[PDB]
Amino acid sequence: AMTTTERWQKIQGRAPDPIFELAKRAAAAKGPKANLVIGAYRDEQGLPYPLRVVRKAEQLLLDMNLNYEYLPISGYQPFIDEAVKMTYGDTVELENLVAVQTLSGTGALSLGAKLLTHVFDAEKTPIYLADPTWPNHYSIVKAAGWKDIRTYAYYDHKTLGLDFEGMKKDILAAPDGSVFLLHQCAHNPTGVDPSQEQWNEIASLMLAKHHQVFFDSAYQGYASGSLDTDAYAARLFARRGIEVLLAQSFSKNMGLYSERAGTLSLLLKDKTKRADVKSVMDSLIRAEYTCPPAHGARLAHLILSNNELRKEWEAELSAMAERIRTMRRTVYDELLRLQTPGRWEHVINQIGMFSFLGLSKEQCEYCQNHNIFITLSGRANIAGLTHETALMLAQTINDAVRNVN
Amino acid sequence: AAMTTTERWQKIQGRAPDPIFELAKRAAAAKGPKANLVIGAYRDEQGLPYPLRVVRKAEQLLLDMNLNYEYLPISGYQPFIDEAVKMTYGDTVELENLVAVQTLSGTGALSLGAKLLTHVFDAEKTPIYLADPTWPNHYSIVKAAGWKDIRTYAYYDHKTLGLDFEGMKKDILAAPDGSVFLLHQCAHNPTGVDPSQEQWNEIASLMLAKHHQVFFDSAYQGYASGSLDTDAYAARLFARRGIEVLLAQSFSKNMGLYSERAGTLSLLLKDKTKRADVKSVMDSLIRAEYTCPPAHGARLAHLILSNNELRKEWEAELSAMAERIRTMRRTVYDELLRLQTPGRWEHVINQIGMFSFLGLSKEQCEYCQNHNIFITLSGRANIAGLTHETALMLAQTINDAVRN
Numbered sequence: 028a029m030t031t032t033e034r035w036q037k038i039q040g041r042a043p044d045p046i047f048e049l050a051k052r053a054a055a056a057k058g059p060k061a062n063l064v065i066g067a068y069r070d071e072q073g074l075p076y077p078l079r080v081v082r083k084a085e086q087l088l089l090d091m092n093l094n095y096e097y098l099p100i101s102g103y104q105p106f107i108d109e110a111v112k113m114t115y116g117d118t119v120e121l122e123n124l125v126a127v128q129t130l131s132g133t134g135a136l137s138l139g140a141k142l143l144t145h146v147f148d149a150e151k152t153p154i155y156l157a158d159p160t161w162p163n164h165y166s167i168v169k170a171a172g173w174k175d176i177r178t179y180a181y182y183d184h185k186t187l188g189l190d191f192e193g194m195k196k197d198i199l200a201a202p203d204g205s206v207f208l209l210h211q212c213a214h215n216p217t218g219v220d221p222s223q224e225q226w227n228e229i230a231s232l233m234l235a236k237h238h239q240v241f242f243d244s245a246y247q248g249y250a251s252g253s254l255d256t257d258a259y260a261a262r263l264f265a266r267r268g269i270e271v272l273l274a275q276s277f278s279k280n281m282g283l284y285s286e287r288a289g290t291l292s293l294l295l296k297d298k299t300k301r302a303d304v305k306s307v308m309d310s311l312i313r314a315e316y317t318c319p320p321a322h323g324a325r326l327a328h329l330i331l332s333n334n335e336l337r338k339e340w341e342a343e344l345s346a347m348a349e350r351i352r353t354m355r356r357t358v359y360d361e362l363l364r365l366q367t368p369g370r371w372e373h374v375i376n377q378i379g380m381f382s383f384l385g386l387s388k389e390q391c392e393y394c395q396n397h398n399i400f401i402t403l404s405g406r407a408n409i410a411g412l413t414h415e416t417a418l419m420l421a422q423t424i425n426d427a428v429r430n431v432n
Numbered sequence: 433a434a435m436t437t438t439e440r441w442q443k444i445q446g447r448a449p450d451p452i453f454e455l456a457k458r459a460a461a462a463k464g465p466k467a468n469l470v471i472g473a474y475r476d477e478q479g480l481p482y483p484l485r486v487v488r489k490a491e492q493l494l495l496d497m498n499l500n501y502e503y504l505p506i507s508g509y510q511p512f513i514d515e516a517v518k519m520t521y522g523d524t525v526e527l528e529n530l531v532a533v534q535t536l537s538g539t540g541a542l543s544l545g546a547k548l549l550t551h552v553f554d555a556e557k558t559p560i561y562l563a564d565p566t567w568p569n570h571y572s573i574v575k576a577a578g579w580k581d582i583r584t585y586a587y588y589d590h591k592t593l594g595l596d597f598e599g600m601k602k603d604i605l606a607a608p609d610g611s612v613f614l615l616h617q618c619a620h621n622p623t624g625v626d627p628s629q630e631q632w633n634e635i636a637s638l639m640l641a642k643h644h645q646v647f648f649d650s651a652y653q654g655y656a657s658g659s660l661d662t663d664a665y666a667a668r669l670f671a672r673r674g675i676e677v678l679l680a681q682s683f684s685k686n687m688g689l690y691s692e693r694a695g696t697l698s699l700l701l702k703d704k705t706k707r708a709d710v711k712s713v714m715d716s717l718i719r720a721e722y723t724c725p726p727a728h729g730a731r732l733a734h735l736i737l738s739n740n741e742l743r744k745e746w747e748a749e750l751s752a753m754a755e756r757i758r759t760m761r762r763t764v765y766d767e768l769l770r771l772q773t774p775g776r777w778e779h780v781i782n783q784i785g786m787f788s789f790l791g792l793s794k795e796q797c798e799y800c801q802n803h804n805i806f807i808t809l810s811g812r813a814n815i816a817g818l819t820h821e822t823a824l825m826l827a828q829t830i831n832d833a834v835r836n
């Protein structure tokens with residue numbers, strides 16, 4: 028603390044991201060293995076799967092010779108409009124909402140959490156996250172300045188299902204005018220979503236308590252294989268009059284992980300305030316990164332907008348969702364043939380890319396040590412499996428259960 | 433007292449608009465003959481957006497590589513980082529003794545760097561010094577990163593239209609030891625005024641004696657003079673003088689990659705264990721903001737930096753862009769001489785890079801704007817948006833503004 032060298036010498040290091048680390052360990056791991064850490068889709072051969080429609084869009088886009096001039100702060104409008112239309116339906120009135128392009132879902136979550144501090148007192152108003160949830164959610168929200176982060180009950184670790192009664196109690200027990208970060212479909216990590224009727228009950232509670240709803244929509248398409256089906260909760264909440272804030276990602280459903288394409292949108296009840304909310308969002312973006320990367324949004328716009336590419340895309344995503352169910356069925360069937368102790372129906376009843384297996388930290392540690400790389404919380408990327416490794420996963424679960432529990 | 437969400441959203445405070453934004457909009461919508469010289473992007477000799485030929489080549493090469501779209505590491509695409517830092521510092525002892533990450537271009541590196549520095553300095557008490565004048569977004573970025581005592585150092589001499597080097601030195605010395613100084617590495621924005629080599633060396637010495645932290649904004653290497661070496665002088669000199677340089681790098685102007693957002697943040701730091709701690713803070717800050725950076729811009733810049741043939745093509749293509757800006761500076765100058773406009777006008781050809789402080793009063797800049805010559809009220813013009821034709825128009829309108 029006199030020369031700059033001395034000043035830097037005192038910088039406090041930070042722990043590394045456990046997920047991204049484990050994925051690195053898995054990727055380095057030796058013989059036959061299952062790298063099931065990160066939620067990234069793999070094909071039948073277990074290899075990365077750039078979508079055929081994205082390969083088509085690459086060539087279309089290159090032939091068009093668009094320029095590289097700065098986007099507006101808010102980003103590439105053709106993409107934003109199509110993207111909001113994909114989640115809210117061709118019905119949606121673009122004029123009654125505010126929406127910007129973001130750095131995928133993470134970017135929309137960070138941006139939205141910061142925005143909310145201009146409307147709510149982030150020193151006092153709680154923000155509620157699901158129990159359990161993406162551990163990065165807590166980090167993002169905290170970094171954005173939220174000082175009272177809480178949990179709503181969601182998953183029942185005994186029944187390996189939804190704890191809906193606990194969720195309702197926690198919504199009602201929260202102070203009025205709190206923020207709730209909800210998973211729009213394919214809850215991460217549990218893979219269990221409310222029913223349609225349960226979503227409508229949640230909406231009525233959010234209304235009666237004057238809560239702010241923040242949807243995280245990272246997996247639209249993966250809960251059912253159908254984009255329209257999976258948009259049910261967002262569309263319901265819109266129809267019910269909720270001022271929905273929603274963070275959207277194209278990393279998983281279009282496979283654009285590396286290009287960072289997403290949106291942040293707000294259904295603003297008072298149209299005269301749209302300009303003011305846009306001006307805050309734009310100042311937040313301007314002071315971080317000035318404007319977003321164009322390539323991913325340009326690619327996604329072509330795929331959303333063109334009727335042929337859009338239908339090809341939806342068929343490709345439907346097939347992706349179906350390979351995941353086949354993998355679930357393969358693991359489940361093998362768990363039955365080995366007569367592994369316990370119930371395993373949640374492997375096939377859960378939806379999305381993951382299975383939340385319900386194993387102990389020690390059983391998970393066992394798995395990792397036999398080259399089955401699932402998280403310590405028991406989360407497994409089913410979309411990482413091949414027929415070979417789905418069988419290995421079951422065999423290792425069977426071993427872990429019979430030998431540690 | 434707001435109760436419903438709609439009532440809370442009702443109370444949100446709109447954030448005042450960028451006056452440059454409003455002017456640029458006026459300029460872009462204007463009919464009739466005009467010169468839109470507001471926003472800082474390169475235009476070619478026909479006044480048009482200029483995708484680089486080497487970037488169009490690299491696009492096709494990348495497509496033919498059949499690459500996937502899987503996440504980059506949090507810190508970004510490491511071959512890009514390595515080539516990017518080798519470009520600014522050269523193939524030298526530095527490359528092993530630094531920490532660097534990919535960022536969302538210069539802006540991203542500036543925000544990340546300003547946040548990072550709050551983990552080494554007390555942003556509540558330690559002053560951070562910006563140039564007088566500077567890019568208005570500098571103030572926004574630092575304020576938003578948490579800096580509470582934002583100050584300025586004398587830089588442009590509004591009388592001489594050159595550098596106020598004595599005043600700069602005085603402010604460097606008068607600041608408390610251990611302050612942060614955000615320096616423009618080359619092509620100062622908005623003025624085009626840069627210190628000489630010998631002046632940069634005096635500055636390095638002052639920074640060492642005062643134990644100031646140096647934060648370089650490096651948005652224009654190569655693009656300023658046409659030479660990557662020339663334009664890297666300050667960074668390399670400061671490195672050689674032993675300064676722990678924090679540096680924000682952009683490929684927006686020098687590769688025309690405005691839309692793809694490719695940049696780096698790097699720190700020169702000797703101890704290897706501490707390099708890894710610094711890294712861990714950079715990665716933590718990234719992760720909570722956007723998880724990892726976009727790949728397409730980084731893959732384009734890496735291929736151009738690394739492919740020996742594209743690298744050579746690019747340096748020639750950049751040299752020609754820089755030359756064309758000088759050419760426009762020369763055209764304006766000659767016309768102002770030709771028209772015998774009152775006053776000194778040599779600053780038009782002594783300034784370097786895209787931007788020029790023309791030296792006009794507010795009333796004269798208003799006159800330019802009302803005659804469809806869109807420069808800012810502080811007299812900033814983007815020389816690089818001129819054509820031979822609008823260069824002459826500018827000089828003639830300046831000559832009218834000055835005369836009435």
Ligand SMILES: C[As](C)(=O)[O-]
Pocket residue numbers: 130131132133134245276278284722723
């Ligand atoms: C983790 As994401 C939705 O920012 O690719």
Ligand SMILES: C[As](C)(=O)[O-]
Pocket residue numbers: 316317536537538539540651681682683684690693
């Ligand atoms: C203005 As920039 C250096 O972030 O493209």
